[PDB]
Amino acid sequence: IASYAQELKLALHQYPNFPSEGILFEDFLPIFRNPGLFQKLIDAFKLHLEEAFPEVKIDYIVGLESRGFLFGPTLALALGVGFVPVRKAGKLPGECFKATYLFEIQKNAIPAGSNVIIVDDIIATGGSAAAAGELVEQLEANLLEYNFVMELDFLKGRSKLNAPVFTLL
Amino acid sequence: IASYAQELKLALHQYPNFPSEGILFEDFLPIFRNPGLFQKLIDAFKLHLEEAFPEVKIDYIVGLESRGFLFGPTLALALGVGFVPVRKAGKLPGECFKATYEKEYGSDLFEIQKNAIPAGSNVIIVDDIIATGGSAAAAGELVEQLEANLLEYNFVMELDFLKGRSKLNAPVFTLL
Ligand SMILES: O=P(O)(O)OC[C@H]1N[C@H](COP(=O)(O)O)[C@@H](O)[C@H]1O
Ligand SMILES: O=P(O)(O)OC[C@H]1N[C@H](COP(=O)(O)O)[C@@H](O)[C@H]1O
C-alpha cells in the first residue's frame, strides 16, 4: 500500500489555476494511461479492503459520477462484486432515490441489508460523498467505508460524513 | 461472442419515455451489478478485438464521458493498454484539443488532453450507445487532432434507425 502510493503520487500531474485562479488541481488521469500504474491503484484499494474488512463480504462498490467511474467498476470486478453508479439528477432511468448537496441512485439496484463501499477520486467539501451516503441509507444498505484516491485536508470534507474514510494518497 | 451477447441482451432493462416522450431508453447498468455479466461484457470486447486486430498493437482505449467510463478503463486494463478519457468542455486540466457536436437545442463540446496520446498511436474509441453519432464523431475529430490512428469504434448498443454510423469515418463494431 505504501510503496504503491509513492509511485502513484509521482504519476499525479499538478495544474495551477484550474478550474479557476488560485486552485491547485491534482490530475490522476496519467495513472490510467499506464496499465502498470492502473493495476497498482486497483491492487492498493483491494489490499486496503482485505485489511480493513477481512471477514465482511462487500456486496457492491458505489461510484460517484464522473471520475469515480474511472476506477470503481474496475475495483468491483477485481473484488468479484457488483458496481452501482450514483449519478447527477435526471441521468438515471426508472424509479430513483434523490439526495441534495442533486444526486440519484436506482431503487432496484441494491437490496436492503447490502454492505457497500462508496468510491470517488477526491473529497473536497464532502458534499457529494455525503449525498451518496444519504442515497445508500434510503436503500436501507450498510455503508462500510468511503474510499478516495486523494483528500484536501484543509477543506475538512470528512466532517460532513458519518461513516469511516480511507484516502490512498 | 454470440452466446455472451444473448445473456447480456437479456440483462438490459427497457424504460419507455425516458428522458422524454417517445424515446425508448436501453439501460445497460444491470450488467455492472453482476460481476459474472460484467466479465462477459469485457471478455466479449476483448475477443472481438483479438479477432479484428490479431497483429496490430492497440496503444489506447479512448472512452467517452460518462457511460464509456463504466467499461472502457476495465477493457483497457484487461488488454494491457492505456486508457484516456474524452470529456465534456472545461473538465480536463492543461492544454486540450476541442471538437464541437450538435444536440437537440444546442451545440456542446468535447475535449482531450494534448499530452495523453502520442502521434502515431493506434486507438479504439468506446462508448455505451451510438444514437445520432454526434458524440462519437466529435471523439474521432479529437483523435485526428492528436495525429493518432482510429482503428475502430466499439459500442455496446446501436440505434439502427438513427443511422449514427453514417457520421463516422472509421469502422464500427456493436456488441449487441
Ligand atoms: O466535475 P464535477 O462538477 O462533477 O465535480 C467532480 C468533483 N466533485 C467531487 C468532490 O467535491 P466535493 O463534493 O466538494 O467533495 C468529486 O465527485 C469530484 O470528482
Ligand atoms: O450524457 P449525455 O446527455 O450527453 O448523453 C449520453 C448518451 N448519448 C450518447 C449517444 O448519443 P449520440 O451522440 O446522439 O450518438 C452516448 O454517449 C450516451 O451515453
Ligand SMILES: Nc1ncnc2[nH]cnc12
Ligand atoms: N435510446 C437511448 N437509450 C440510451 N441512451 C441513449 N442515447 C441516445 N439515445 C439513447
